[PDB]
Enzyme design. Structure first.
Site, PDB file in Angstrom:
ATOM      1  N   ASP A 153      -1.590   5.784  -5.137  1.00 51.65           N
ATOM      2  CA  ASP A 153      -1.969   4.813  -4.078  1.00 51.65           C
ATOM      3  C   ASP A 153      -2.276   3.372  -4.587  1.00 51.65           C
ATOM      4  O   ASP A 153      -3.348   3.120  -5.129  1.00 51.65           O
ATOM      5  CB  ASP A 153      -3.155   5.381  -3.260  1.00 51.65           C
ATOM      6  CG  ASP A 153      -3.653   4.550  -2.081  1.00 51.65           C
ATOM      7  OD1 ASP A 153      -3.067   3.484  -1.812  1.00 51.65           O
ATOM      8  OD2 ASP A 153      -4.606   4.995  -1.398  1.00 51.65           O
ATOM      9  N   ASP A 163       0.787  -1.217   0.000  1.00 55.43           N
ATOM     10  CA  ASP A 163       0.000   0.000   0.000  1.00 55.43           C
ATOM     11  C   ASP A 163       0.838   1.297   0.000  1.00 55.43           C
ATOM     12  O   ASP A 163       1.379   1.702   1.042  1.00 55.43           O
ATOM     13  CB  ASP A 163      -0.983  -0.061   1.192  1.00 55.43           C
ATOM     14  CG  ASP A 163      -1.946   1.098   1.314  1.00 55.43           C
ATOM     15  OD1 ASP A 163      -2.122   1.832   0.326  1.00 55.43           O
ATOM     16  OD2 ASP A 163      -2.544   1.252   2.387  1.00 55.43           O
TER      17      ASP A 163
HETATM   18  C1  LIG Z   1      -2.943   3.364   8.866  1.00 54.30           C
HETATM   19  O1  LIG Z   1      -4.173   2.711   8.571  1.00 54.30           O
HETATM   20  C2  LIG Z   1      -4.476   2.737   7.181  1.00 54.30           C
HETATM   21  C3  LIG Z   1      -5.950   3.130   7.056  1.00 54.30           C
HETATM   22  C4  LIG Z   1      -6.515   2.907   5.650  1.00 54.30           C
HETATM   23  C5  LIG Z   1      -6.201   1.551   4.979  1.00 54.30           C
HETATM   24  C6  LIG Z   1      -4.717   1.195   5.205  1.00 54.30           C
HETATM   25  C7  LIG Z   1      -4.212   1.337   6.636  1.00 54.30           C
HETATM   26  C8  LIG Z   1      -7.072   0.426   5.574  1.00 54.30           C
HETATM   27  C9  LIG Z   1      -7.308  -0.463   4.410  1.00 54.30           C
HETATM   28  C10 LIG Z   1      -7.781  -1.756   4.422  1.00 54.30           C
HETATM   29  C11 LIG Z   1      -7.943  -2.412   3.216  1.00 54.30           C
HETATM   30  C12 LIG Z   1      -7.630  -1.812   2.004  1.00 54.30           C
HETATM   31  C13 LIG Z   1      -7.867  -2.475   0.734  1.00 54.30           C
HETATM   32  C14 LIG Z   1      -8.977  -3.277   0.534  1.00 54.30           C
HETATM   33  N1  LIG Z   1      -9.320  -3.861  -0.624  1.00 54.30           N
HETATM   34  C15 LIG Z   1      -8.535  -3.588  -1.673  1.00 54.30           C
HETATM   35  C16 LIG Z   1      -7.414  -2.788  -1.604  1.00 54.30           C
HETATM   36  C17 LIG Z   1      -6.594  -2.532  -2.817  1.00 54.30           C
HETATM   37  C18 LIG Z   1      -7.073  -2.252  -0.378  1.00 54.30           C
HETATM   38  C19 LIG Z   1      -7.146  -0.516   2.022  1.00 54.30           C
HETATM   39  C20 LIG Z   1      -6.994   0.148   3.227  1.00 54.30           C
HETATM   40  C21 LIG Z   1      -6.492   1.543   3.450  1.00 54.30           C
HETATM   41  C22 LIG Z   1      -7.527   2.543   2.920  1.00 54.30           C
HETATM   42  O2  LIG Z   1      -6.925   3.123   1.757  1.00 54.30           O
HETATM   43  C23 LIG Z   1      -5.632   2.678   1.747  1.00 54.30           C
HETATM   44  N2  LIG Z   1      -4.809   3.205   0.770  1.00 54.30           N
HETATM   45  N3  LIG Z   1      -5.296   1.814   2.648  1.00 54.30           N
END
Ligand SMILES: CO[C@H]1CC[C@]2(CC1)Cc1ccc(-c3cncc(C)c3)cc1[C@@]21COC(N)=N1
Length: 368
Positions: free
Chosen positions: A216, A32
């Site tokens: 992202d 991520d």
């Molecule tokens: C520090 O805490 C942060 C808060 C936000 C999240 C990451 C950790 C939580 C989170 C959980 C799942 C997914 C995800 C689910 N399905 C598919 C994909 C491709 C991803 C993305 C995210 C987030 C929200 O957005 C981004 N970019 N990451």
């Protein structure tokens, strides 16, 4: 050795295999670029294949600090600690990194997914609970000789590559074009122009970056600011008027289906984003195809361009077309046509330049 070290499922993101603790515990971790914590499942949540068991690691160290993280779509809560971390299909190194042990969550883990944690590859400024919690990549760079750079090749229908500490030239065709990182928090960039099938949207370039534009890998869609999305859909509707589709479809409220093997790709336009270049008054453009923005649902497809209230998000629909270089040492992001991108015999994703564009800095959004 690092080539094809990423696996995934459509709309479920891309994960890398990682080991944590002593003896090593293997975990699949979501890559991520839009977050900065290394947070792993540490309890038997029913959707989890495996989880980090701290009591089994002799190198685990408790930070005696909790972390509570609400986010638009859900929430996660964890306990902070440090442990030894390695990437089997990455560089031959072991680092002591901050790990958030997830003990409680909501809409965080996915039912049927093969990942148990998230590797936040962005900067300290957005780390939780504050910038004092050093992100994994920063720890990796401080403790080893691994260069302050990583690159991503996400291959749509899934697999891909995360090249840690370098660039693999076989993963891209043509040249790499660089955009400066505006500020080190998210991977923030500046969009100076938007074209649909070569037609400019003619909007105030500040609208394209209201309130930010980011790259992202933890987002599936190309997310556009509300006013930009309206103009993009209006132009895409016009270019594809040869066929009709309910409004819900352009809103991602419903799906569109075609009989197999016959999808009308040519009726759909190309989408071009011009980005701020390295030098004053110079830009380059990245072009993506309907193969990137129409996402198969398993021939049924979802419109993968959506409205946003947090600015532009260059998610998986953008990244799948391109080899992306996160050049942290030079505060820039490189783009080149991906050797694995999905296309047809008529059109291909493109990275073209240089272009002359004036007042590019006026395009960044700044709090009044
Ligand atoms: C520090 O805490 C942060 C808060 C936000 C999240 C990451 C950790 C939580 C989170 C959980 C799942 C997914 C995800 C689910 N399905 C598919 C994909 C491709 C991803 C993305 C995210 C987030 C929200 O957005 C981004 N970019 N990451």
């Amino acid at each position: 050795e690092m080539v094809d070290n990423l696996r995934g499922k459509s709309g479920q993101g891309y994960y890398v295999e990682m080991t944590v603790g002593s003896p090593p515990q293997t975990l699949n971790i979501l890559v991520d670029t839009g977050s900065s914590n290394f947070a792993v499942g540490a309890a038997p949540h029913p959707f989890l294949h495996r989880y980090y068991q701290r009591q089994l690691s002799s190198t685990y160290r408790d930070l005696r600090k909790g972390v509570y993280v609400p986010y638009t779509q859900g929430k996660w809560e964890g306990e902070l600690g440090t442990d030894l971390v390695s990437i089997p299909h990455g560089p031959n190194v072991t680092v002591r990194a901050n790990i958030a042990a997830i003990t409680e969550s909501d809409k965080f883990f996915i039912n049927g997914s093969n990942w148990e944690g998230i590797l936040g590859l962005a900067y300290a400024e957005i780390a939780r609970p504050d910038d004092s919690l050093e992100p994994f990549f920063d720890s990796l760079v401080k403790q080893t000789h691994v260069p302050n750079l990583f690159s991503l090749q996400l291959c749509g229908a899934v697999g891909g590559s995360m090249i840690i500490g370098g660039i693999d030239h076989s993963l891209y065709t043509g040249s790499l074009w660089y955009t400066p990182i505006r500020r080190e928090w998210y991977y923030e960039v500046i969009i100076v122009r938007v074209e649909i099938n070569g037609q400019d949207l003619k909007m105030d370039c500040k609208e394209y970056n209201y309130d930010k534009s980011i790259v992202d890998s933890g987002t599936t869609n190309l997310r556009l600011p509300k006013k930009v999305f309206e103009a993009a859909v209006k132009s895409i509707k016009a270019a594809s008027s040869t066929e009709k589709f309910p409004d819900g479809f352009w809103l991602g409220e419903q799906l569109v289906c075609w009989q197999a093997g016959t999808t009308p790709w040519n009726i759909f336009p190309v989408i071009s984003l011009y980005l701020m270049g390295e030098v004053t008054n110079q830009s380059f453009r990245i072009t993506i195809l309907p193969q990137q923005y129409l996402r198969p649902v398993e021939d049924c497809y979802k419109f993968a361009i959506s409205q946003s209230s947090t600015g532009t998000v260059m998610g998986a629909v953008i990244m799948e077309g391109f080899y992306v270089v996160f050049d942290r040492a030079r505060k820039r992001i490189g783009f080149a046509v991906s050797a694995c991108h999905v296309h047809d015999e008529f059109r291909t994703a493109a990275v073209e330049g240089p272009f002359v564009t004036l007042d590019m800095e006026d395009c960044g959004y700044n709090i009044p």
